[model samples]
Target: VHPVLEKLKAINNYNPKDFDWNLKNGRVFIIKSYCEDDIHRSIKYSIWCSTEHGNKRLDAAYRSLNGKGPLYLLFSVNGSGHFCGVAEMKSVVDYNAYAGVWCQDKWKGKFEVKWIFVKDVPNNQLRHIRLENNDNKPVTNSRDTQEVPLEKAKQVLKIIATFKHTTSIFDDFAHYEKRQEEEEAMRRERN
Candidate 1:
């Protein structure tokens, strides 16, 4: 077992609060949500995983479940193309009990998460993670989750730790949209 999982297992209560944030090792996964509000709901309710595609899309979900080390889930807000925060995985909950409560109504796969907010992450800062595609271009598909190698996971934790603390991505949308527009304009000019 990985050290992070050991620390998490040490606590009888098994709450994320008892888990150590200082530990540097773990398996990292990224979960991208389409809206800031959805990310907000994820942090607020401690629930994640996709109910989309009738739960048939679960490659990343299974990866998170059967991985070798400690588990970490990073939440990305897709609209602004920035990562919002990180969380520790408690377990995979396969059913959605709150179908009416959440903005999404599909019942598929769910996960119980224990996570905290981090500073906003822009594209330039995340180059080390190799989140690009076969074309060596940026990837923006919102339908799939990503897995990061353990060594790179260390870099991820280090990068986020360098920034100041924040609890919300409430205003990240506008800033990210402006960033996209600026980049798009530059692309058009080159063309």
Candidate 2:
């Protein structure tokens, strides 16, 4: 268990999820997303995983998200390429290659369905974590990912704790989308 998670155990009724977040598992990768809103409202139901990479990282992500694999911490990315905040995205993880059969790539990974909202943080803190504090301009590059240090997991854990969300929405990318449409439809009916 990461010391960050360990510390949480001492808190009041903390439901600590376990993961092998040790330095050996791999460094945390800060991937990009278009905006903060999309990450919290849509990314979990949309973009978050793959096959070859799944074989490698899924276990860690699996253990991290309490075996609910398809979820993710939406690391915010601006149009100019800069991270802002992060939040959780959960859903049963399975391969896109599945067919009309026992098709999910169990060999790859899987997780139970869930929906949880999230929020983000300041770019200054990001650079601080990266050991860069003065520069304001985004670090544009061909690479779409940044490696998060293991020690910094404690910091990341604390930062994400600030977001608010508690829900049990199910799978289907359209599930979230459908709910949004229904919300507007109800407003129309009421008005």
Candidate 3:
């Protein structure tokens, strides 16, 4: 087991609030699944960054029917450039969310998820964090860092994408249909 996972296990459930953002370039983190109400549920996760404000925003999330699942929250960031990031928890009520690997058809189901963006944080820069829950509550002040150079941001995005993969929990939900269709349209246009 990774050292971070061991540390996380010592905590009662992996609460985002416990993360230490001051530690840079730390090991990738993971939290094992736990049984809730006789149903085995695990977060199967990784986080790139953490801040006090980010934690509060994560805790304040709400449910949205229009979203891919039962629990969905949106956050944003704005700065010298434009970039948006989304965090999703798949299979809040179902177990088939992570059905496939390395494909869109794999992701499905109702998820307890949160999406956030920093308005001033440009796509070319990487130093900004923002969080807002489904309740329209602002839980954290935009944690903004010194602007990352364009080349650096691009490299960072590549690294982030390496960890990106669809979870199986989304398979049981139909909310992603529209998103799929739109993506297909965009694909055909490029062709």
Candidate 4:
């Protein structure tokens, strides 16, 4: 959250370079499963994905297991199935990333299930923030990635980090402890 919050502030305050460029790192999607429980099961057990933009299997293969490689965000509908929010996560082990992890039967590739927040917009502003404020809409393809003018060099971040007005009420933003615990559990399972 701190890394992303820092990115949002930088995007809002600093001038971005290459307004024309986006992430070569990876893509974002409106994930159908937004909870830690679901996200973990999907990756750890090779659960099926029903996302509108992409599938967990193919897209996961295309993603950079390395954070420095490609960054991903998931725009999702929370438990109420009404609010739209965004989140980013990663499993960086020994500073190395793998395209996928072992699911026993097969390899299951995935990103971590981390913080998600409802996107907030101000008066006369777009509901979704553009990459580096460059009017670049988030894409659904995983082969592609978008860079952040805000994060710059390391200068990139994700959807959850774009809050301007206030904290997203769509999500409690209070389930971090629970989510973190789930993440740890999944790490052990992955290993």
- Highest TM-score against the true fold, candidate: 1
Between prediction 1 and prediction 2, the one with superior lDDT is 1
What lDDT does model 4 reach? 0.37
Q: 2 or 4: which has the higher lDDT? A: 2
TM-score, each model?
0.59, 0.39, 0.20, 0.32
What TM-score would candidate 2 get against the native? 0.39
Name the TM-score of candidate 4: 0.32
Write one digit per residue (lDDT tens) for candidate 3, span 126-153.
3332222213221222232222223333
| Global CA lDDT computed for model 3 | 0.29
lDDT of 1: 0.54
Write down the lDDT of every candidate, Cα atoms only.
0.54, 0.38, 0.29, 0.37
**Residue lDDT tens for model 2, 1-191:** 33432342344232123322232332344545443333334333333433345424544554565742233342545453334333333444555433211112232333332222233344444444442321322322213344344556445545444423232112232444555567568768999
What is the lDDT, from 0 to 100, of the residue 93 in candidate 4?
21
In terms of TM-score, how similar is model 1 to the real structure? 0.59
What is the full ranking by lDDT, best candidate first? 1, 2, 4, 3
> Model 1, 1: alpha-carbon shift in Å?
40
Every candidate's CA RMSD: 12.8, 11.6, 19.0, 10.9
Q: Which stretches of candidate 3 lie over 4 Å from their true place?
A: 1-82, 86-93, 97-103, 108-110, 118-120, 127-191
